[PDB]
Design a protein around this ligand. Structure first.
Ligand SMILES: OC[C@H]1O[C@@H](O[C@@H]2[C@@H](O)[C@H](O[C@@H]3[C@@H](O)[C@H](O[C@@H]4[C@@H](O)[C@H](O[C@@H]5[C@@H](O)[C@H](O[C@@H]6[C@@H](O)[C@H](O)O[C@H](CO)[C@H]6O)O[C@H](CO)[C@H]5O)O[C@H](CO)[C@H]4O)O[C@H](CO)[C@H]3O)O[C@H](CO)[C@H]2O)[C@H](O)[C@@H](O)[C@@H]1O
Ligand SMILES: [Ca+2]
Length: 155
């Protein structure tokens, strides 16, 4: 399941050695675009991520964690989110390697007020057993985005 979904502990950000804890990937680090996060952290029980350059596609900035799920089983995906200026983000369940098949994908419009978003999800019979949750923060307005109470739980 999700580790540090309440944000009582710092964001680890070590994709190479601990991808099962929260990490950020940015396209600017890979010669793909200018996509860059200037600051991130936790305070008062929530996560914040400050975008300096959003890149040119939604996946150019990702806030992700690997998770194990059972084939054929139904889950609930839930999270709280907001942003200093109104804009969209995506939420996905996808493979953690090429070809990055998206098993679940939705877009949500954020405002300056905290709101909650909750979706049912059935893991496909032939999906990989280890996948990742991904919040895609690229393309849209450069601003600060906030998260809290992220869960992926059996129905
Ligand atoms: O070593 C060579 C190379 O390495 C670079 O470094 C590595 C870097 O690539 C890797 O980044 C991961 C990142 O890619 C991943 O983002 C994925 C994103 O790739 C994915 O893109 C999809 C496309 O895959 C899909 O394209 C295909 C299409 O073009 C083709 O014609 O048809 C196919 C159909 O059969 C179709 O699949 O196309 C869509 C466009 O609609 C793209 O969206 O999209 C998903 C989201 O859906 C996104 O997650 O994110 C990972 C983290 O989750 C990144 O890790 O990262 C490694 C280390 O982290 C690097 O090693 C260098 O930059 C280059 O210089 C080198 O040459
Ligand atoms: Ca919290």
């Amino acid at each position: 399941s999700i580790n540090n979904g309440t944000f009582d502990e710092p964001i680890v950000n070590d994709q190479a050695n601990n991808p099962d804890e929260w990490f950020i990937w940015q396209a600017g680090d890979y010669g793909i675009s200018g996509a860059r996060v200037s600051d991130y952290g936790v305070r008062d029980g929530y996560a914040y991520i400050t975008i300096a350059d959003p890149g040119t596609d939604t996946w150019h900035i990702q806030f992700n964690q690997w998770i194990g799920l059972y084939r054929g089983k139904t889950y609930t995906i839930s999270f709280k989110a907001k942003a200093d200026t109104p804009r969209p983000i995506n939420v996905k369940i996808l493979q953690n390697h090429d070809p990055w098949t998206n098993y679940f994908a939705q877009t949500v419009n954020l405002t300056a007020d905290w709101q909650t978003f909750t979706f049912t999800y059935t893991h496909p019979d032939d999906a990989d057993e280890v996948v990742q949750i991904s919040f895609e923060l690229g393309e849209g307005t450069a601003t600060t985005i906030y998260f809290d109470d992220v869960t992926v739980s059996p129905q």
